[PDB]
Symmetry: C3
Subunit: 213 residues, 3 copies
């Protein structure tokens, strides 16, 4: 087949060392050669991002430019409709064919709340999902009937991600970084340092555009 | 809150790749952005170090100059008294404020003998302690009554070190290095190579000052 | 004692990021300062390598040339006989002294298929997601007899232990590569650029 390509969505307001280091650390224990970052647009019934749709692309571009691992996909920024996760993967499966392995990166706490999403049953039909294990927290699913769904498709063999097109779930041990897009905004609104949390190109973009102030 | 600041003490005679690489591997999996190296002065009842207070400070300064992670604290070298751990941590909690998170880095073999250390109860009051896990050994505490003390304050979530001022104990996965300050002093008195165990600035300083010969 | 010196053997046709990335990850977890790459010549009873003895040396030499962790040993390439693993270990023990720790790196399923522990430890590259199961229930007892969880045992003793090391997963093998070259798709994520360039010069795996 072809090489496994992982997808990684998020709001990215702003992208930060958490997003990048956690995934590139994943790529070294899973053999990820490609990682496509899909920045979403937040549905209107949720707080909308501070940095607009353009700036978030600029901040991502600058942050990814010297990392060949990552490659940026702006479907959801140019999409009129609001972003639905299982819908982007239907497109990816549609465009990339049925035999290329696809993987979607989500966090542990988004696996906990996972049968919530629109069309949860269709995600594992069109891609694997890799789960960023939140250390220290238990493995507990919300409703003990799709706790069975989890160990049915759970696997500890990373070959399954490369040798099959979809259907499995891998749990990956990632480092901890005490940084989020909420942590960042607060230290800037108060004016404490941020060069340890943010790529220098992006922190400079933030200060130029006057973001989070 | 403010950045978690973690303190790391020792004699450092000389500092070597054991100290640095073990802690900078810690920093990547715990989110440590700053680590303050506190070299101690050995109480008179123990063999005193070969290299004097100045050379040990120079050797550290040379080793740490290009690593922003580590900052050096010479309280104990300029102190008249003999170095007591729970006394330095009491200074740090006082000077730094009661709301900043503090951690103290120690090895596993030093936590087994921990209620041996003076004021073992004052440490968890003012700081967290991060324990360097000696691989291949069990977690057995000396007197199975404060084995309950270990499991009372143990935590497997590195958040607690960041989001709480003090009180927890985190066990960290470290690499093994077959290098120690005793090993080095012998390999120098015997005259076999050391550029794999020691930063080249520090090994050059030692060869210039003629230490361990 | 002296430094622990690990030996790492293989065909290396071609050498690739898997061989190297996997071991340099090991070295950091075990404290390996030196790793001697011992490419083998295959005994005639299994399929022969594509690149001859020279090209497989050059490719290795280009991979290892700016990695101080690895040094290269061409015993088995210059050897008249075919290579016998415990014969290389016996020579090393002889030249090196009885006091210097030695370890031999092998993959898990190559351990699935044996007298190493006179002269050296064996560090086994754990295929992730597969169990520790030995075939014949007498050297499943040999495994846990000499199993060790303390990397000290590899650095403080000259042999006798077996260390099972967690390694990363890389979707690359020499077999994967040969086809992706004969099929004509990229390999720069699987193969060092000096080595991949060497392969296109010599027209290897095409």
């Amino acid at each position: 087949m072809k090489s496994l390509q992982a997808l990684f969505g998020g709001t990215f307001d702003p992208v930060h060392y958490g997003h990048l280091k956690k995934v590139e650390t994943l790529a070294n224990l899973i053999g990820l050669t490609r990682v496509t970052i899909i920045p979403n647009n937040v549905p209107p019934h949720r707080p909308q991002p501070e940095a607009n749709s353009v700036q978030r692309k600029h901040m991502l571009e600058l942050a990814i430019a010297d990392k060949p691992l990552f490659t940026l996909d702006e479907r959801e920024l140019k999409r009129n409709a609001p972003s639905v996760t299982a819908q982007t993967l239907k497109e990816w499966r549609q465009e990339q064919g049925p035999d290329v392995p696809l993987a979607f990166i989500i966090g542990q706490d988004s696996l906990l709340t996972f049968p919530t999403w629109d069309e949860y049953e269709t995600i594992l039909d069109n891609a694997h999902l890799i789960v960023q294990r939140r250390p220290g927290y238990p493995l507990e699913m919300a409703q003990p009937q799709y706790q069975q769904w989890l160990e049915d498709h759970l696997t500890h063999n990373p070959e399954d991600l490369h040798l099959q097109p979809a259907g499995k779930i891998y749990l990956a041990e990632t480092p901890f970084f005490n940084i989020s897009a909420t942590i960042i905004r607060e230290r800037l609104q108060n004016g404490e340092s941020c060069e340890d949390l943010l790529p220098e190109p992006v922190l400079t973009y933030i200060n130029q555009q006057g973001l989070y102030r």
